[PDB]
Amino acid sequence: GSSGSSGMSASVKESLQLQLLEMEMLFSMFPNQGEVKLEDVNALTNIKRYLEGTREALPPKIEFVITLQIEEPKVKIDLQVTMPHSYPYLALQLFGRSSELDRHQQLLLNKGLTSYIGTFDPGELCVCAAIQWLQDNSASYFLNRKLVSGPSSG
Could you tell me which residue ranges the RWD domain spans? Predict the structure, then answer.
């Protein structure tokens, strides 16, 4: 239908739509099967149904974890991406932590990221940029002054 007046707002329908399309893009950038871990492969379906209007019940958002295959330093950083019924419109929530990384370090990384993603316009994807961002700015953080190198004996 339609009303007489209306301020500024968007219908979840669209949001979800952009949340499903981005999936096809992410899968492409990730050829490895052990990359994108979807809590449930049916998380995308339930949604497609809501778009029709048959399912009045709000479907489960698209939440998963993407592994950052850092080329150098050759390390792994588990990235927990969560796209609610708002994003991209809303600032999604990400979590970057690795066994190597430390408490102080993480903070710096996460912070630097959150801001980067918080500088995007409500309409386009952001998680697609968070991946590259981290990679390019992944070692910059690790790089630290610590005496670990040393000889060995028997």
Answer: 21-141
